[PDB]
Design a protein around this nucleic acid. Structure first.
Ligand SMILES: Nc1ncnc2c1ncn2[C@@H]1O[C@H](COP(=O)(O)CP(=O)(O)OP(=O)(O)O)[C@@H](O)[C@H]1O
Ligand SMILES: [Zn+2]
Ligand SMILES: [Zn+2]
Lengths: 115, 65, 196, 286, 103, 116, 240, 69, 440
DNA sequence: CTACCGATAAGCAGATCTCTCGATTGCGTATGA
RNA sequence: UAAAUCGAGAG
């Protein structure tokens, strides 16, 4: 589970070769199905993904106490600035290639690091 | 000594019995046994009105807000 | 989850009209004429009596809930279909909402545009004995925001009072889940025993 | 009785409560809430009270909601008018919050209930006994830290952030809105961007995380212990994660997540663990 | 214009509308105290036991001032009035009692 | 009933109640009567604006009674209330505007293409 | 519906179809006339004056204004006088004597005419210890009646008991009917719905109700007054 | 506890870099990001562990049952 | 300007060596402040602590022998004067000599409790001041909580804490019993010393008193023990005091207690209940009904001593009233032990004023001028610390111990024995016969 | 006048899906040593 | 290997 009440049982141990790999060679270690979010509305996990990506890239730690951001300091924009400066996608997406077909997927995949 | 249907002793403060519950012509205090004539108090009138939360009616709701 | 600059401008412009919704609803409920400033002593006394009794409080809560629900429906209709930075079918959230794969339109609107008005059991948020729905609010407040109606969205966060109200609604749901899980076995068993 | 009343703002954490039968019953304290376990010296408080314009209870001829009754730990002290009682309550709060009178302690909770129409019973109730509930808030004048309790709070105006302070309305202000939440509820990152049931689930699940219970496990004989072999501090964490020294007991790990419907084996809530990461030590425990 | 440390007036509190015959009289009982002295009143009557008391919890922290004032002259004469919580008892019923342990 | 360590009264002072209205003032213990509404006495400031019966020494100056006229109650009862100078609120000092989240400075490009 | 087969359901009501020639008017007045009105719903307040000069009891119940209450509840002043005289005084008398036994263990009141004096004397004869009586038949605004009581009995509230009697008295109520609210038509169905089940009440009023379509929320009453098959139909309807 | 040897995601050996990272932090005024860049960790997959390792082994070692306290 | 820092170097230094003076995290040990504070307040602090206050308020128990004073003679006055708890030592068998210190490390390893022996001193007085025979008994090992005043880890810095094999930053406020850690869970109850209006149908529904109104209070003794005083309402115009001494509940008219508790006339009641509100017909009528009802029901209770005598006569077996104490003394005892305990004994006038205010509040509530106070809202609640529960249980157990002593003496009298009250051999025989394992 | 028949009011009787772990088990007493 | 009660609970 993450830190947003997202349970999950490991359905299968996906071999690393069949695992989708990214442009940089990073194969993620955990897949979470995107269909969970529209009903759960845990946007905190989405924000935490790119915040952690920026933190791991820049070797820093970002505080996540509630009620630091507001309507005019959206955390998505704030961490997207850092991601763009680091050189990744401003929206947190990341080009990815299927591990079986080897071809680039239709759209850039949302990838990050979460606790 | 008197406020409503109450008669209070002016010496000690005990509650004298009702003038309709005594033999007559005087009332004796139950503590200091002082003499109070049956006169000096004859109309123990009280006025009581029911609360506004006693008769909930649709018309009353039209008299509010 | 994002929105275009024009879409955010529309949403903010419509939300700016929700400032006086609570005061207008209160003025209508208290049978007072409009234009009444929010600090009128007669309005305060009438709100006090409405809080004291249990039926006028329900009536006022229903009226204010209807008004703020009209406002949030306006925001939803104006923003959700043609206000997003990414459009269908590129918008994956909109795709899963439309295709019924998971979630729904109210979920997407809560995420992106507005979290709406909180309702625990067909009514607005409970009030203190003094007429304050929360320590942060003036006694006998006339405001949609200080009534459980939250203007935040799950993409851009919610202020602490709105967070409190949302937690309250979640608690109501959590209790009702247990009750609904508990409330069927005897009926099922007796019917099948009779009709076996 | 399980519903979340607003009177518990700042004392009982709204987020923290276990889902299930005890939902709303077995709640938790706010992380900044302290219970006064020792009786403050209320001996000299009456002496100040009579000096402030309070007629003594010995010779008063006063009762009912028509006059303000001044109590002290459940004893009648005097009888004062209503607006007067409000003035005395405000002056007592000011004197307590400032450090000048040795009599009034900071922990003395002063709950003044003003007159109303069929409201709560008016009075002026002072408390200094044990078992009280105390929360630190910032008194707007003198900018000094104050202490308030549940009884006194529900009749007070406490802005949640300094920007919301209104003129002639707000008298106090919370130090930070983050102190109305318990621990394991302040450790959830970006809690304002989540649905409340999910916050409750996360709180209930943090207590079930498989992590390091202690470090003295070679000097114990507990029947069952769960230990996470390789724990890491979160890259993203609240300011209170290291304020309580939680890094001494790491709970999980930083995993490269990917929000992508690719494998087909994870649809409802399940998830896929990379095999290579798994047998390289990801999540191992004993 | 003057303050009288020596007692010169007393005020009691029995109840509203208290009245007694002119023959009724009271006495005083003063402690050998230095500050915040307590005054005790003892009354005499044909059929009622008048007694008085003072509570040390309140009388020590406040002081009462009794004085006259000319309608057109600002001259006043302050005085020390001890306030008393005073009750009235019946002599006959005061000593009334009963058997200690019933059978 | 008389307790131990308790003395009695020996004499009193003639109170000229006739000479005229009897007043009552509830002064605090901190205030001392010397050179006597927002009147100021000593170094503090105060606000000042038949509940109890009245007694007086008799002719012999060794007995009490109820003062009256051919009972009697005090015309004006004053309760001296101590007050403090309660300060105003410096809104310009307490209501500070919000600050943006502090962006980390010196953020240099880190992502590089493979083999570069 | 299924488990208990309760014949005393919490909210029994029935559906009353209306003829297509009955508009909102001449139907709202029928609803008001058929609705139950209690004695408490027309009394503004009561001013109980007690004297012990033999314990007298002067009860003066201020009434709602005629023009509004007679239009709202379709109740006439003559009807009010009749119901109070026949029910209120008797019920108050019974309550007072029960309480005593348990304890043991405006103007124009001088110009009353011959009819008023005869009514007062008759009511005194009918009742136990009522001494005076008057009713403002001119406007239906007030009604006073002294309640001379024995001096031996101790003091009584004469407020709580009057309250309870006014609450439990009945002005004009057909049995097992509380109110007849006319809801909005569902789809061209001009329907009146009551608050209690009693089929025989509206069987007389053929003019306003088409008795051929009286369906009720009850099941036991339907079984007892319409046979088994109507009960089966209403069971299916109320479970659907 | 002790620093992981290989990288969970990719597989790069980061077990030899913990001591070097600590030395670069202590004896030199090198920020975490610059020290990780100098160490040779470019991807965030490799960076995150050496950046967020906790080293509980040292706290565990203070309780030795084989030596006098 | 980093928003947050990993503090890698500082954390690694702390793991290198623990702090030598104070714990690094002030807020980690402030979370367990309730339990530690309560436990260290039940032993240390003012007046010798809550334990000393409780054993002082417990009082004495009396029994009699076969020597024909006017009574049975040989007036035994057994009571516990002081209670002292010491940090746990180990006997190491029968070696004795110096007493080694025991630690939670070997307590947990032993799979046994972490208990320190408890010392109790009795005052065995005969004939009320003739023969005092003090003799201090150890009634077992009372379990003590960690990091408290009576624990060996009381003020040790983290360096010595890790030196004693305990933990790096142990803050435990739990108890160790049978090698299993246990914690006295917190509890939330009614706010102390506050009469709050209560509306509850369960009063009238299966309650002898007939109404759903009332004024409930939960007064706590200075030793932290509570006794509810529910002020019910009766529909006919009177109110009835209620309280529970044993597992059964008692009802008394309010005027009887109001008179017996402090001398007063029936006029002062009217003046106090009705403060200048003499035009309030509802209050005047209800007060008339109450006063006349009391006068009718009890016409022979014309004096304060007489109502006290009636109360003492009524409450004789329930309060274990020995023949030595008179009826007036028993009435004063039950009054001071039941009504408004939080105002303390010798506070009769204060209790009178409090009960009068309670009556006025009840009448105002039933008149609709006030609103019922929610017993579930935090506005009218407080929390029991758990350590105060420990003090309550200890006071009750000491009371039970004195009860067992008196019962053993009574059984000895019932059987045919020497029954001498100045014999130390008989002292040992009667004391050793009873089961006195308070620690168990 | 007095026996038979119902009509309340109080009491009596009974109701409000599977599985896994852990923990626990009484005082009183009375005679043979 | 029992049997009952309490706590943690999972769906
Ligand atoms: N095919 C589907 N499978 C699952 N959920 C679907 C769905 N189609 C729609 N939904 C939506 O999923 C949401 C919850 O559906 P439910 O049947 O209650 C499963 P749940 O486990 O109770 O959700 P939870 O994660 O909030 O606990 C609804 O909004 C529903 O519209
Ligand atoms: Zn008398
Ligand atoms: Zn790697």
């Amino acid at each position: 589970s993450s830190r947003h009440g997202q349970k999950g049982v490991c359905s299968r141990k996906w071999p690393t070769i069949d695992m989708p790999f990214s442009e940089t060679g990073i194969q993620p270690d955990i897949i979470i199905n995107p269909h969970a979010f529209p009903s759960r509305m845990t946007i905190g996990m989405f924000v935490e993904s790119l915040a952690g990506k920026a933190g791991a890239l820049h070797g820093i730690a970002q505080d996540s106490t509630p009620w630091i951001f507001n309507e005019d300091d959206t955390p998505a924009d704030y961490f997207g600035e850092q991601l763009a400066k680091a050189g990744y996608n401003y929206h947190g997406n990341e080009p990815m290639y299927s591990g079986a077909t080897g071809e680039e997927l239709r759209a850039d995949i949302y990838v990050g690091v979460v606790y | 000594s008197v406020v409503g249907s109450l008669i209070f002793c002016l010496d000690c403060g005990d509650l004298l019995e009702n003038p309709n519950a005594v033999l007559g012509s005087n009332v004796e205090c139950s503590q200091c046994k002082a003499i109070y004539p049956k006169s000096q108090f004859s109309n123990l009138k009280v006025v009581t009105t029911t609360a506004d939360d006693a008769f909930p009616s649709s018309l009353r709701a039209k008299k509010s807000v | 989850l994002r929105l275009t600059a024009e879409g955010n401008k529309w949403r903010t412009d419509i939300l700016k009209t929700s400032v006086d919704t609570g005061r207008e609803a209160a003025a209508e409920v208290t049978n007072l004429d409009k234009d009444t400033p929010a600090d009128d002593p007669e309005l305060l006394k009438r709100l006090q009596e409405i809080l004291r009794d249990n039926n006028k409080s329900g009536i006022l809560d229903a009226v204010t809930s209807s008004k703020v629900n009209a406002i949030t429906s306006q925001v939803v209709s104006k923003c959700v279909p043609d206000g997003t930075m990414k459009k269908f079918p590129c918008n994956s959230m909109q795709a899963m909402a439309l295709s019924g794969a998971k979630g729904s339109n109210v979920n997407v609107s809560q995420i992106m545009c507005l979290l709406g008005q909180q309702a625990l059991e067909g009514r607005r948020v409970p009030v203190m004995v003094s007429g304050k729905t929360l320590p942060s609010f003036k006694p006998y407040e006339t405001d949609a925001m200080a009534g459980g109606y939250v203007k935040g969205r799950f993409y851009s966060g919610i202020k602490p009072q709105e967070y409190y109200f949302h937690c309250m609604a979640g608690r109501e749901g959590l209790i009702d889940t247990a009750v609904k899980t508990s409330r069927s076995g005897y009926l099922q068993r007796c019917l099948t025993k009779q009709l076996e | 009785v399980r519903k979340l009343l607003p009177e518990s703002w700042g004392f009982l954490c709204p987020v923290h409560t276990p889902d299930g039968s005890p939902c709303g019953l077995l709640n938790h304290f706010a992380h900044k809430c302290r219970i006064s376990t020792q009786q403050s010296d209320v001996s000299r408080i009456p002496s100040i009270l009579y000096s402030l314009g309070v007629a003594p209870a010995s010779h008063t001829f006063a009762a009912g909601p028509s006059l303000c009754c001044v109590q002290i730990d459940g004893k009648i002290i005097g009888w004062v008018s209503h607006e007067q009682g409000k003035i005395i309550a405000d002056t007592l709060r000011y004197w307590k919050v400032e450090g000048k009178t040795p009599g009034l302690p900071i922990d003395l909770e002063i709950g003044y209930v003003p007159p109303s129409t069929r409201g709560q019973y008016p009075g002026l109730y002072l408390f200094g006994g044990h078992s009280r509930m105390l929360r630190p808030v910032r008194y707007l004048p003198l900018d000094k830290e104050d202490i308030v309790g549940p009884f006194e709070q529900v009749y007070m105006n406490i802005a949640v952030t300094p920007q919301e302070i209104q003129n002639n309305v707000h008298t106090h202000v919370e130090f930070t809105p983050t102190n109305i939440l318990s621990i394991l509820a302040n450790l959830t990152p970006f809690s304002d961007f989540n649905q409340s049931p999910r916050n409750m689930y996360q709180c209930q699940m943090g207590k079930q995380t498989m992590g390091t219970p202690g470090v003295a496990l070679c000097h114990r004989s507990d029947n069952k212990l769960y230990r996470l072999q390789t724990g890491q501090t979160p890259i993203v964490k609240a300011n209170l994660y290291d304020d309580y020294g939680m890094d001494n007991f790491p709970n999980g790990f930083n995993a490269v997540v990917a929000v992508i419907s690719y494998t087909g084996y994870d649809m409802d809530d399940a998830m896929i663990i990379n095999k290579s990461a798994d047998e390289r030590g990801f999540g191992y425990g004993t | 214009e003057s303050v009288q440390d020596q007692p010169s007036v007393a005020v009691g509190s029995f109840f509203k509308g208290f009245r007694a015959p002119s023959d009724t009289t009271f006495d005083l009982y003063k402690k050998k105290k230095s500050e915040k002295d307590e005054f005790v009143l003892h009354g005499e009557n044909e059929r009622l036991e008048y007694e008085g008391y003072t509570d040390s919890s309140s009388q020590a922290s406040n002081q009462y001032v009794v004085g006259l004032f000319n309608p057109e002259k600002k001259s006043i004469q302050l005085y020390k009035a001890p306030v008393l919580v005073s009750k009235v008892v019946s002599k006959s019923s005061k000593n009334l009692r009963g058997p200690k342990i019933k059978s | 009933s008389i307790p131990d360590g308790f003395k009695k009264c020996k004499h009193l002072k003639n109170f000229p109640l006739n000479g005229q209205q009897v007043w009552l003032i509830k002064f605090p213990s901190n205030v001392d009567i010397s050179k006597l509404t927002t009147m100021t006495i000593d170094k503090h400031d105060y606000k000042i604006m038949s509940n109890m019966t009245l007694l007086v020494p008799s002719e012999s100056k060794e007995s009490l009674k109820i003062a009256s006229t051919a009972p009697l109650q005090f015309d004006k009862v004053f309760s001296v209330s101590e007050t403090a100078k309660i300060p105003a609120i410096d809104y310009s000092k307490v209501r500070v505007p919000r600050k943006d989240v502090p962006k980390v400075e010196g953020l240099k490009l880190e992502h590089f293409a493979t083999g570069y | 519906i299924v488990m208990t087969a309760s014949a005393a359901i919490k909210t029994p009501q029935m559906t009353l179809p209306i003829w297509n020639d009955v508009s909102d008017e001449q139907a709202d007045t029928f609803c008001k006339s058929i609705s139950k009105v209690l004695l408490s719903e027309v009394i503004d307040k009561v001013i109980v004056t007690e004297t012990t000069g033999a314990r007298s009891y002067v009860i003066h119940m201020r009434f709602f204004d005629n023009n509004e209450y007679s239009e709202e509840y379709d109740v006439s002043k003559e009807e009010l006088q009749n119901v109070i005289s026949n029910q209120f005084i008797h019920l108050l008398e019974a309550a007072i004597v029960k309480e005593i036994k348990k304890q043991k263990r405006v103007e124009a009141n001088n110009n009353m005419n011959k009819v008023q004096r005869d009514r007062q004397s008759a009511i005194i004869s009918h009742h136990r210890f009522i001494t005076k009586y008057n009713f403002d038949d001119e406007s239906g605004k007030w009604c006073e009646f002294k309640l001379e009581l024995a001096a031996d009995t101790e003091k009584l509230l004469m407020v709580n008991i009057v309250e309870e009697i006014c609450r439990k008295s009945i002005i004009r109520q057909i049995p097992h009917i509380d109110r007849c609210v006319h809801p909005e038509p569902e789809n061209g169905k001009r329907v009146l719905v009551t608050e209690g089940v009693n089929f025989q009440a509206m069987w007389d009023q053929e003019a306003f109700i088409d008795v051929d379509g009286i369906t009720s929320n009850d099941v036991a009453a339907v079984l007892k007054t319409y046979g088994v098959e109507a009960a089966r139909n209403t069971i299916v309807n109320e479970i659907n | 506890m002790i620093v992981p040897v290989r990288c969970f995601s990719c597989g790069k050996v980061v077990g030899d870099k913990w001591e070097s990272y600590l030395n670069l932090l202590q004896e030199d005024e090198l920020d975490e990001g610059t020290a990780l860049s100098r160490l040779g960790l470019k991807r965030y997959c490799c960076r995150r562990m050496i950046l967020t390792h906790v080293d509980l082994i040292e706290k565990f070692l203070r309780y030795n049952p084989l030596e006098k306290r | 300007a980093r928003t947050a820092d990993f503090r890698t170097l500082e954390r690694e230094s702390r793991f290198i060596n623990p702090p030598k003076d104070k714990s690094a995290f002030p807020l980690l040990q402030e979370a367990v402040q309730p339990h530690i504070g309560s436990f260290n307040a039940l032993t240390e602090g003012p007046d010798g602590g809550l334990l000393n206050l409780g054993v002082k308020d417990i009082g004495e128990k009396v029994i009699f022998d076969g020597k024909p004073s006017g009574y049975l003679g040989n007036k035994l006055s057994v009571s516990v004067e002081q209670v002292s708890i010491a940090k746990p030592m180990s006997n190491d068998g029968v070696s004795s000599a110096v007493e080694r210190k025991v630690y939670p490390s070997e307590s947990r390893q032993r799979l046994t409790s972490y208990r320190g022996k408890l010392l109790l001193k009795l005052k065995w007085s005969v004939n009320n001041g003739e023969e005092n025979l003090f003799e201090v008994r150890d009634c077992g090992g009372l379990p003590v909580m960690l990091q408290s005043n009576r624990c060996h880890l009381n003020k040790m810095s983290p360096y010595e804490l890790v030196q004693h094999k305990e933990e790096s930053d142990e803050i435990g406020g739990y108890f160790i019993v049978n090698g299993i850690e246990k914690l006295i869970r917190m509890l939330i109850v009614q706010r102390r010393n506050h009469p709050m209006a209560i509306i509850r149908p369960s009063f009238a529904n299966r309650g002898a008193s007939y109404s759903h109104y009332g004024i409930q209070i939960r007064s706590v003794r200075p030793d932290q023990t509570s006794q509810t005083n529910v002020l019910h309402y009766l529909n006919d115009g009177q109110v009835t005091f209620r309280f529970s001494w044993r597992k059964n509940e008692y009802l008394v008219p309010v005027v009887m207690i109001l008179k017996a508790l402090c001398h007063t006339s029936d006029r002062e009641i009217f003046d106090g209940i009705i403060g200048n509100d003499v035009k309030d017909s509802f209050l005047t009528d209800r007060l008339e009904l109450l006063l006349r009802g009391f006068k009718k029901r009890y016409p022979h209770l014309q004096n304060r001593t007489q109502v006290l005598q009636y109360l003492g006569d009524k409450f004789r077996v329930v309060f274990q009233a020995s023949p030595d104490q008179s009826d007036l003394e028993v009435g004063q005892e039950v009054l001071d032990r039941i009504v408004l305990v939080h105002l303390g004994k010798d506070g009769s006038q204060d209790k009178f004023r409090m009960l009068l205010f309670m009556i006025r509040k009840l009448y105002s509530l039933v008149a609709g001028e006030c609103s019922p106070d929610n017993p579930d809202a935090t506005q009218h609640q407080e929390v029991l610390l758990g350590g105060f529960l420990y003090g309550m249980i200890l006071k009750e157990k000491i009371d039970e111990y004195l009860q067992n002593i008196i019962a053993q003496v009574r059984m000895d009298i019932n059987r045919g024995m020497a029954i001498n009250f100045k014999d130390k051999r008989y002292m040992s025989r009667v004391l050793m016969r009873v089961n006195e394992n308070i620690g168990s």
